[PDB]
């Protein structure tokens, strides 16, 4: 029998690329934003060339959305055996349930 | 064996390839078999399509028969000489 080697995203080196925050309410959330402000350092220089005023700017960035997905099934016989509905007083049945 | 000089099979670098195991009752054996099973790891997709359903495999193999022979011979009176226990009796050089 082969066992699958499970991997955890936090242990990979790629984890340092992004920062992940668990957000248990994302289903209710329509578009979200983030706010940016930044002020450029200026330089005072001699002459008629404009030694201009400092510059501000306010950039906003919008949030995108995508979703993962995965599926699997369980047969009906297994459903009965697990539920405890079909088990009989036979050792042969407990083996199948296991 | 200590006084002999043999090339034992379990000292080369070749032994590390096959897992030898002694089996006395190999002769009373019909088709010998062996089983396998694997789960292949899956990854979740983006567009929902209900067709991933992690697979299951059950491989099976069979044994292959093979022999290994060796010959040996001796004369008939030749053996007869080693039977008697004698201390000459005019047969040493022959014995």
Automatic annotation (TrEMBL), chain B:
Residues represented out of the complete protein: 51 to 148 of 1330
Gene that encodes the chain: UL19
Top-level division of the source organism's lineage: Viruses
Name of the protein in its database record: Major capsid protein
Organism: Suid herpesvirus 1 (SuHV-1)
């Amino acid at each position: 029998c082969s066992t699958l080697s499970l991997v955890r995203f936090l242990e990979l080196g790629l984890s340092v690329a992004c920062v992940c925050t668990k957000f248990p309410e994302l289903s209710y959330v329509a578009e979200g934003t983030i706010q940016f402000e930044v002020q450029q350092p200026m330089i005072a220089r001699d002459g008629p060339h404009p030694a201009d005023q400092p510059v501000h700017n306010y950039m906003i960035k919008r949030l995108d959305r995508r979703s993962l997905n995965a599926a699997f099934s369980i047969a009906v016989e297994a459903l009965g055996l697990i539920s405890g509905e079909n088990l009989d007083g036979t050792h042969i049945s407990s083996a199948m349930r296991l």
